[PDB]
Amino acid sequence: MNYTETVAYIHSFPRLAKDHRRILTLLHALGNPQQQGRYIHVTGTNGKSSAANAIAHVLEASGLTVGLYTSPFIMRFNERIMIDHEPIPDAALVNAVAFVRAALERLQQQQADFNVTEFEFITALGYWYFRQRQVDVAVIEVGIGGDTDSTNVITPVVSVLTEVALDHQKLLGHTITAIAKHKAGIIKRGIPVVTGNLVPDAAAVVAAKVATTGSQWLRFDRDFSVPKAKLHGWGQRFTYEDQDGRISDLEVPLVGDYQQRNMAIAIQTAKVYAKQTEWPLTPQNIRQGLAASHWPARLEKISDTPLIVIDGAHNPDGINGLITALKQLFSQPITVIAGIYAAMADRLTAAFSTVYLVPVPGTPRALPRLKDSWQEALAASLNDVPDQPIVITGSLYLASAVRQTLLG
Predict the structure, then answer these.
(1) Which residues lie closer than 8 Å to 305 by C-beta, 6 or more apart?
(2) Which residue of 26, 104, 268, 339 is 20 to 30 Å from 261, comparing CA positions?
(3) How many CA atoms lie within 13 A of 298 on its CB side?
């Protein structure tokens, strides 16, 4: 197969009953790559990808070759599997798919109805690839939950649980407790866990879990915190504090109050990793990693003149926090192009001068200022008020579509 056929092959896999027996069968065929090397395992309802990316950036700065298995914000497949933030090259992906396919075919020869899910195939490929390339550590983001996730076939150096919230209600459960219990599944015996300042129900689950595992638990706003933080350019200046002291006036080109938490989680986790592996990590490394970090489609200013911002804010509270973020960035009238119901559009028209409502591209258009597409809304705003800034937001698929179009 070529690259195109290879990606299509990956997307062709069936969705099957949800234990890890299927993926473990495949990983066995691949020489159990998941049993070798080192891992940082990351889960949470929000902030999981943010934390994982930052952790990788920091460890990379410190001189480690770091694998990163993530949900990308660019919509190209290769972006899910990175080494030092370089996506797996097309040719490497072709060869890796071919190798895992051969394993799979060998298994289906001994067990006629053996198969895996798409996520299972990709996860097995990722673990294998990271071992092939001999990364020092792989930062592994859970797909969903933790407990029953395909990624949960490793013993990490440290586990991370950013936060537990309603969002992922569909699969995990109807309560904070039920969802927390799934997430807590990535906490392992004697292995430290770094968490956000969890809501009471989730904190109670983690406390009980760590009581059984004997894990050191480092908790945001208990063991580590961000005592100082403010807007500084298109990003923030902040101070990190933990049991070892302070790292003063760090900078991250990332806006959002909740990003302070994610970045502190990342710093703490990197520090734990380094300590557990006897590896040097300095304040300069941390500073550089955060300074060099890239955040596609997170209040990303992709153009200066005209001023165009793309953002993947989606959660009906990541949009009320988008409003407050935008108010911190801008004092002057702006246009908002929102690819999104009712309350959200009223919340936006009330906060901002001009608000255009558009379809999310590559999504079934349902039955609901209004414009036929983001391009038309953008063309309208630029025609009418060329110097007025434009923010495109409300979706993950829109921000990616806009990015691909305006940046290469």
Answers:
(1) none
(2) 339
(3) 21
Give the list of residues 6+ apart from residue 109 with CB closer than 8 angstroms, or none. Answer: none
Going by their DSSP bridges, the two strands 236-242 and 245-252 should be labelled as antiparallel
Helix, strand, coil percentages (3-state) for the chain, rounded to 5, are 45, 20, 40
| Distances from the Cα of 308 to the Cα of 73, 98, 107, 395, angstroms | 17, 41, 51, 16
What gap in Å lies between CA 261 and CA 137, rounded to an integer? Answer: 23
Spell out the domains of the chain, with CATH numbers in brackets.
1-296 (3.40.1190.10), 297-408 (3.90.190.20)
- The structure was resolved to a resolution in Å of 1.9
Kind and range of the H or E element at 225? Answer: strand 225-231
Contact yes or no for 365/397 (Cβ under 8 A): no
Residue with tokens 């949009």: 319
Query: How many CB atoms are located within 10 Å of the residue 135 CB?
Result: 20
Method: X-ray
Burial of 110 from C-beta contacts in 10 A (0-12 / 13-18 / 19+): exposed
Tell me if 356 sits within 8 A of 380, measured CB to CB: yes
